Each structure stands twice: as C-alpha cells, then as structure tokens.
Amino acid sequence: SDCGLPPDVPNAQPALEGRTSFPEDTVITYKCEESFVKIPGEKDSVICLKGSQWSDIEEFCNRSCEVPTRLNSASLKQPYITQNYFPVGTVVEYECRPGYRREPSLSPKLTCLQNLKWSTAVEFCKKKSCPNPGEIRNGQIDVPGGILFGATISFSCNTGYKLFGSTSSFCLISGSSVQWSDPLPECREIYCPAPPQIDNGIIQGERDHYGYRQSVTYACNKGFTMIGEHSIYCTVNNDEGEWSGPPPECR
Amino acid sequence: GCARWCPQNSSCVNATACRCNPGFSSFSEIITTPTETCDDINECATPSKVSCGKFSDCWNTEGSYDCVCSPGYEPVSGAKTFKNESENTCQDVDECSSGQHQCDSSTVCFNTVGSYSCRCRPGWKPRHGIPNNQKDTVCE
Ligand SMILES: *[C@@H]1O[C@H](CO)[C@@H](O[C@@H]2O[C@H](CO)[C@@H](O)[C@H](O)[C@H]2NC(C)=O)[C@H](O)[C@H]1NC(C)=O
Ligand SMILES: *[C@@H]1O[C@H](CO)[C@@H](O)[C@H](O)[C@H]1NC(C)=O
Ligand SMILES: *[C@@H]1O[C@H](CO)[C@@H](O)[C@H](O)[C@H]1NC(C)=O
Ligand SMILES: [Ca+2]
Ligand SMILES: [Ca+2]
C-alpha cells in the first residue's frame, strides 16, 4: 500500500503540488505547457492504483494554433465557435457581420499552419453600400466619406431656403441590409413678410408670393414727387424676412 | 438616456455609447460608433486562467464556457457543467458492472481508465495472429 513518482509524459508536466509520496486513489493531472493543448477525450491524468501502479497515458498533446483571429469583416460560423483545439491543417468557416456582404472571389476560410499561426486573413466580406443618397431640391449634400455602412452625410440648403429635417443622416443596419437613419430633409424657400403699401403710391405687378432676392418696385401717383427713393428688396437673416431700407415715400 | 444603435451584444448606457455584455469583449470600453463590434471571449482557449481539470474538456460557447467530463468518465454529483477546477468530480465508468461493453464470450470485461479491454478467460489461448488484452481479443 503505497505510491511513487508519476511517469514523465512527453511535452507535458504534472502538478505535483509538493507531494513526496501519494496515497492510493490520488490522481495527478498533466498539463500541456508550451504550444500544445489537450485532445478532447484524452486522458490528462493518471490515478494511483493498488500496489503503487499508475495507469498508462499515451501522449495527449499535439501542435495547435491559438484562437482564430478577430476580424472586423466576419465571425466564426456556428459549429466552429465551440472548438478550442486546432491542430495543423484545421479549417474554419466565417460568415459576414451584420452590415457586410461576401466578396465571392475569396474564401470564407483560413486554416492553421505549421508555424502555429493562422493563415493570412483576407477581407472576403466587404461593407454594404447603402442606397444612393439622392438630391435635395434646392439643397446640397456633403458626402465626406462615402455611402458604405457607417458613414455620415450632412445636409445643406441653398441660400434663401430653410431646411426642415435632420442636419445629418448616418447609415445603420436595418434588418437584412443597410439603410439611412433619417430621410431626406426638405428645403422650403423663405418668404419676406409683406410688401408695405405706400400712401398715394401704386405698387407695380403684385404677385401672390414674394421670395428671396426679390425687389418690389414702387411708383408715386400723378402729381407726387420722390419716385426716386428707389425700391426695396427682400433680405433674409437667420430665417427672418427683412426689407432692406424703409419703404419709399410719396410727397 | 439610451442609445438606439448598439451592436448585437451590448446595452445602452448613455445615448452616445454602448457597453459590452458579460462574456463579450470589445477593443474599447465605451462603444462610440456602431461600426465597432463586441466579440465573444475564448474562456476555453489559451491563455485562460480557468482550467477545467482532470478527465474534463472545456467547450467555449457564446457568452459562457462549459466544463464537462470526457466520455468514459462521469460526474458523481450529476451536475454536468461546472465552472472551475474545484468543482471537478469526474470518475471512471465501471463498464464491467454496467454490462454495456462489447467483449465476446472468449474474453472478460476489464475496467480501465476511460475505457476497457478484454482478457482471455483463465485457461484460454488467444489465436496466434491477434493480440491479447485488447478490445479485439479472441481466445480458444
Ligand atoms: C496531431 O496533428 C497531426 C496534424 O497536425 C495529425 O496528423 C495526422 O497523421 C496521420 C498519420 O499519422 C495522417 O494520416 C493524417 O492525415 C494526419 N492529419 C492531419 C490533419 O494532418 C496527428 O494524427 C495528430 N495526432 C493525434 C490526433 O493524436
Ligand atoms: C457616457 O455617459 C456617461 C453618463 O452620462 C458619462 O459618464 C460618460 O462620460 C459618457 N461617455 C462619453 C462622454 O464618452
Ligand atoms: C473557483 O474555485 C474557487 C475554489 O477555491 C471558488 O472559491 C470560486 O468561487 C471559483 N470561481 C468562480 C468564478 O466560481
Ligand atoms: Ca465564450
Ligand atoms: Ca473504465
């Protein structure tokens, strides 16, 4: 009734835990130490049997790459997430991330090499392209980057128009494919408040609405002077409509 | 507030950034733009401080890790999944006293570690080409 030292498994090291001798039914586990990891289901320990007999262990470590690389394009397909052992020649699949599409010429796979390093990753998933932004009637759009997933475009109205919408719009994952956060804003032209009506003076050619940069022309009645104060024009400041000078006077 | 653009595995903390769920790691602690992603950590793979222990295999899952006793062994406490080494209770199966072996009449069940073999009945000769003390032993 006793035990002795455990065997020496190649490419592994036991956890002695500072035990000179071991009682029977004690069990010591070996650990793959450098570049090696355990085979699923192999025996990583040896129990001490009656008559100081230790169980035979076949070498249970093998060469292995480490974890598949983190990719911004894709993630490990579902069967391959559970695996933690990657001997030389191990193939793993990949599926494109939420806002990405497969580039069909390339391979959604990369395998373990003899250098214990994974094969060089490729960008087999490229970013999706949100639809073309379009055109804001009487408005501009600034595309500083591009239409690819995760880029913001800004919105601008031509002068004399006022936007009622979101300043910018960014493109985010919309169920299956990508789409813009905010619809296209609408530019609407600012109108100067009202044309002042002059006493003893007719206003030529009234229209239903008066827009920006518009000049409204006055004329005095028969026998009245100062038709030469010129006219006034439509000015807009910070969405408020202003007429430039005071309205001309008939004398 | 709350952010409305978080990726697949995060929670809205402020309206301007997200935070990765437990079990998942990011390259930043605050997820500013939605083009950054949370990915699952490899609790099973090297280098992981957690070790399952003897006769037990680790199985990485999304947002979790599972230790289970390898086949040919079983847990005493019935609890299949455990979390670190101090919970390891894996014990070898007595394939002999269970009757669920595959040796024939010329042999006898031989309990080993994780499996079994077949010894000749006392007074029986293994046919010359076959080896004794293995699962394919035939005696006469
Ligand atoms: C350790 O890994 C190597 C591969 O890296 C395994 O090699 C196999 O070897 C046999 C012959 O011994 C070949 O017929 C197989 O095709 C090889 N497989 C591969 C993927 O190369 C080796 O068997 C492994 N050791 C084990 C599993 O104990
Ligand atoms: C996120 O919000 C919290 C609370 O509002 C704040 O402490 C933190 O600084 C924010 N993150 C930023 C501003 O990047
Ligand atoms: C790891 O095992 C120790 C044993 O001392 C235990 O106290 C601890 O709770 C375990 N860790 C976790 C995260 O369960
Ligand atoms: Ca995990
Ligand atoms: Ca057994």
Author numbering:
A (entry chain B): 34 to 284
B (entry chain A): 25 to 164
Quote from the publication.
The adhesion G protein–coupled receptor CD97 and its ligand complement decay-accelerating factor CD55 are important binding partners in the human immune system. Adhesion GPCRs are characterized by variable tandem adhesion domains followed by a common GPCR autoproteolysis-inducing (GAIN) domain at the extracellular region and a canonical seven-transmembrane (7TM) domain at the C-terminal region. CD55 is a GPI-linked membrane protein with four short consensus repeat (SCR) domains at the N terminus. CD55 regulates the complement cascade by inactivating the C3 convertases and plays a critical role in inflammation and pathogen defense.
Herein, we report the structure of the adhesive domains of the CD97–CD55 complex as determined at 3.19 Å resolution by X-ray crystallography. The CD55 and CD97 bind roughly antiparallel to each other involving each N-terminal tandem domains. Structures of CD55 and CD97 in the complex superimposed closely with prior monomeric structures, with a Cα r.m.s.d. of 0.9 to 2.1 Å and 1.1 to 1.2, respectively, suggesting no conformational change is needed during binding. In CD97 or EMR2, EGF2 and EGF5 each bind a calcium ion in the N-terminal tip, which contributes to rigidity within the interface of EGF1–EGF2 or EGF2–EGF5. Our complex structure reveals two N-glycosylation sites in CD97 (Asn-38 and Asn-108) and one N-glycosylation site in CD55 (Asn-95), but none of these carbohydrates are involved in the CD97–CD55 interactions. The preeminent interactions of CD97–CD55 come from the EGF2–SCR1/SCR2 interface in the middle region, which buries a total surface area of 1278 Å2 and contains six pairs of hydrogen bonds. In the third interface of EGF5–SCR1, Val-137 of EGF5 inserts into a joint hydrophobic pocket formed by SCR1 residues Val-60, Lys-76, Val-79, Ile-80, and Leu-82 and EGF2 residue Phe-79. In CD97, the Pro-71 and its preceding residue Thr-70 adopt a cis-peptide conformation, allowing the Thr-70 to flip its backbone and form a hydrogen bond to Glu-99 in the CD55 SCR2 domain. The majority of the interactions of CD55 with CD97 come from this SCR1–SCR2 pair, including six of the seven total hydrogen bonds between the two proteins. The overall architecture of the CD55–CD97 binding mode together with structural details leads to a shearing stretch geometry, which is known to resist force applied to the protein interface.
